[PDB]
Structures are given as C-alpha cells and as structure tokens.
Amino acid sequence: ADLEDNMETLNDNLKVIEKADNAAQVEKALEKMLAAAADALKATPPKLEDKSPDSPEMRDFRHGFAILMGQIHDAAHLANEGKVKEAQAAAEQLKTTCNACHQKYR
Amino acid sequence: ADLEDNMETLNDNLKVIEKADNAAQVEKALEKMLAAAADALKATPPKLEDKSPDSPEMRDFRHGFAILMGQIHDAAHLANEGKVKEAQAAAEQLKTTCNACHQKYR
Numbered sequence: 001a002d003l004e005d006n007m008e009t010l011n012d013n014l015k016v017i018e019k020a021d022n023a024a025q026v027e028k029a030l031e032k033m034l035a036a037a038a039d040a041l042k043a044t045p046p047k048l049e050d051k052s053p054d055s056p057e058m059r060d061f062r063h064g065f066a067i068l069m070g071q072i073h074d075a076a077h078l079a080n081e082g083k084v085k086e087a088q089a090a091a092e093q094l095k096t097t098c099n100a101c102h103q104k105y106r
Numbered sequence: 107a108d109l110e111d112n113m114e115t116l117n118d119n120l121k122v123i124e125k126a127d128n129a130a131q132v133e134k135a136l137e138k139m140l141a142a143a144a145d146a147l148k149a150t151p152p153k154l155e156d157k158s159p160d161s162p163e164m165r166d167f168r169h170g171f172a173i174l175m176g177q178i179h180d181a182a183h184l185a186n187e188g189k190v191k192e193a194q195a196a197a198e199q200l201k202t203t204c205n206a207c208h209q210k211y212r
C-alpha cells in the first residue's frame with residue numbers, strides 16, 4: 001500500500017485500541033500497525049520527492065519507522081501478557097513519535 | 107518486491123557486511139537489510155498459503171520479521187558508532203534468526 005493508506009491504517013488502529021474490549025483485540029490492532037509501519041518504510045513522502053533516495057532526510061525518515069515499529073512491537077508484548085491498560089497507554093504514547101515525524105516531513 | 111527478491115537482498119547484504127572495509131559500508135548494508143525485512147513482512151510464504159491470514163503460523167511469521175528488524179536496527183547503531191567489528195559480529199548473530207524462520211517455514 002502507499003504512504004497515505006498506511007497512515008490511515010495507523011490512525012484507524014489507534015482508535016480501535018482506545019475502544020478495545022480486551023487484550024487480544026489490542027494485540028492484533030498493534031500487529032496491524034506494525035505491518036502498516038513496515039509497509040510505509042519504503043515510501044518517498046511529497047516533501048522529500050526532490051531529494052536523493054540516500055539523502056540524510058530520507059534516511060532520517062526511514063529511521064522514524066524503525067523507531068515506530070520497535071515501540072509498536074513493545075506495546076504488542078504488553079497486550080500479549082494480558083496487560084490491557086498498560087498496552088493502551090503505550091499505544092497513546094506512540095503519538096509522540098507520530099508527531100515528531102509529521103513536524104519534520106508532513 | 108516479492109518474498110524471494112527480499113531474501114536475496116538480505117543474503118547479498120550479509121555477505122557485503124562480512125567483507126566490508128569501514129563502518130559506513132556496514133551501516134548502509136544494514137539499512138538496506140532493514141528495508142528488505144520490512145517489505146518481506148507483508149508476504150504469505152508458499153508453505154503457509156492455505157492457512158488463515160491470522161493463523162498462529164502467519165503471526166509467528168510476521169513476528170520473525172519484527173525480531174529480525176530489531177536486531178538489524180541495533181547492529182546499525184553499532185556501525186553508526188564506528189564499531190565495525192562489533193557490528194560485524196552482531197550481523198553474524200542475525201543468522202540464528204534467519205535459520206529459525208527457515209527451519210519452520212522454508
């Protein structure tokens with residue numbers, strides 16, 4: 001999928017996690033975020049279209065996804081342990097990573 | 107790219123790391139591995155073609171890539187520190203993760 005569609009998936013899944021009824025639901029929503037983040041890594045965002053594929057900016061963009069995937073991954077483990085409230089808090093905390101990339105590159 | 111082309115990227119770059127002359131080369135080879143592992147995550151491997159997209163097998167498969175990406179990430183930071191031998195050793199440890207997935211799903 002393209003960057004916009006993956007971003008939509010990330011957004012929608014945050015809301016799913018916020019309203020989730022149990023740990024199993026939070027876990028699979030986080031797994032879907034992890035996939036969307038991985039699939040997004042390959043993208044060239046509009047703001048960087050004229051930069052080299054290997055520019056510092058493009059490499060920084062890709063790093064943001066590495067970080068996001070790690071954080072989603074850790075949160076998924078909290079849900080796997082049945083810690084629903086903790087997983088939900090960790091999902092909310094992800095927004096701070098979302099924000100950092102957007103302020104730079106969106 | 108498809109699953110096999112990404113596997114080829116993983117394999118070629120591991121060889122590059124083994125023969126690399128400086129940290130920057132190692133770091134860039136690792137970044138390309140991390141991208142290939144991210145793109146492979148979406149795949150359905152032939153051995154699991156008949157299972158549910160949400161079967162324990164397919165989730166275990168995607169989890170293999172989450173683990174691999176985290177290890178690749180950590181190794182990239184070692185190279186970023188200029189620690190070439192350490193990053194080479196870390197890249198070598200990656201092979202245990204390659205092998206675990208292959209033994210199950212290859």
Ligand code: HEM
Nearest residue numbers: 004005007008010011045061064065068097098101105106
């Ligand atoms: C889970 C955290 C995140 C959420 C919830 C999120 C959400 C969104 C949403 C809803 C959009 C609007 C685009 C659309 O779908 O129409 C967007 C755009 C965008 N996001 Fe994110 N995002 C997240 C993380 C990130 C990260 C980590 C990066 C970079 C590493 C990033 C880069 C971008 C860029 C470049 C756009 C503009 C895309 C375009 O204009 O085509 N986002 N994001």
Ligand code: HEM
Nearest residue numbers: 110113114116117151167170171174200203204207211212
């Ligand atoms: C550690 C790094 C890895 C390396 C160096 C590597 C290398 C390879 C190579 C050389 C092939 C032959 C494919 C081709 O024709 O190009 C292959 C196939 C395959 N690998 Fe990996 N691999 C790695 C990690 C993984 C992981 C982590 C998984 C699962 C989580 C995985 C799952 C598979 C599967 C299912 C195939 C067979 C695909 C098919 O037959 O279409 N690999 N790998």
Ligand SMILES: [Ca+2]
Nearest residue numbers: 018019020021
């Ligand atoms: Ca609910």
Ligand SMILES: [Zn+2]
Nearest residue numbers: 073077169172
């Ligand atoms: Zn894990």
Ligand SMILES: [Zn+2]
Nearest residue numbers: 063066179183
């Ligand atoms: Zn990092």
